[PDB]
Amino acid sequence: MPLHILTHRECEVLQLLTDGKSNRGIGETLFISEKTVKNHVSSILQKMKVNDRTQAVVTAIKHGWVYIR
Amino acid sequence: PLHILTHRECEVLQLLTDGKSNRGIGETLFISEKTVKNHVSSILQKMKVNDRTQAVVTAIKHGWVYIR
């Protein structure tokens, strides 16, 4: 399950990243600061045991946790 | 516009979709990281995106690369 390992906010960040949004775009969409976006990304890399956004995103797509809009 | 990427740029893009680092890509393709970094920089320029994640997600969307 995604929610066994991620929060809902983290799932939303991952989907917004899969959509192609930047840290600025994600914060705009979620009304959070860019630093906070990076904090969510930092947590996602920890929980998924990957080293950057791209591995996390490609892994989320691979497991069906997010979709290509 | 797939025609604008070189085959080598496509290989780097596929290796990025696989999850390899610039060190892994340089290892796999027997090139230096500086050469890999330039290929990445070139791919973002030709694709008109700002970072690796947008390039990879855009290539997946259009079927240029596959999830191994």
Residue numbers in the entry:
A (entry chain A): 160 to 228
B (entry chain B): 161 to 228
Provide the authors' original text about this structure:
DegU transcriptionally activates the expression of GmaR and flagellar proteins by binding the operator DNA in the fliN-gmaR promoter as a response regulator of a two-component regulatory system. lmDegU contains an N-terminal receiver domain (RD; residues 1–143) and a C-terminal DNA-binding domain (DBD; residues 159–228), which are connected by a 15-residue linker (residues 144–158). Therefore, we conclude that DegU is a noncanonical response regulator that is constitutively active irrespective of phosphorylation.
The crystal structure of lmDegUDBD was determined by molecular replacement and was refined to an Rfree value of 25.3% for the X-ray diffraction data with a resolution of up to 2.39 Å. The asymmetric unit of the lmDegUDBD crystal contains two lmDegUDBD chains (chains A and B), which have essentially identical structures with a root-mean-square deviation value of 0.50 Å. lmDegUDBD adopts a one-domain structure with a tetrahelical helix-turn-helix (HTH) motif as observed for a LuxR-type DNA-binding HTH domain that belongs to the GerE (PF00196) family in the Pfam database. The lmDegUDBD structure consists of four α-helices (α7, α8, α9, and α10), and the two adjacent helices are linked by a 3–4 residue loop. In the lmDegUDBD structure, the α9 helix is the most elongated helix with 15 residues and forms a base frame that supports the other three shorter α-helices. The α9 helix is defined as a recognition helix, which has been shown to be required for dsDNA binding in GerE family members. The α10 helix is parallelly aligned with its equivalent helix from the dimerization partner (α10′; the primer denotes the second lmDegUDBD chain in the dimer structure) and is responsible for ~ 64% of the dimerization interface. To be consistent with the dsDNA-binding ability of lmDegUDBD, the lmDegUDBD dimer structure displays a continuous positive patch that is electrostatically complementary to the negatively charged dsDNA. Each of the three lmDegUDBD mutants (lmDegUDBDR168A, lmDegUDBDN198A, and lmDegUDBDR212A) exhibited lower dsDNA-binding affinity in the FP assay than lmDegUDBD, indicating that the continuous positive patch of the lmDegUDBD dimer covering the R168, R212, and N198 residues mediates dsDNA recognition.
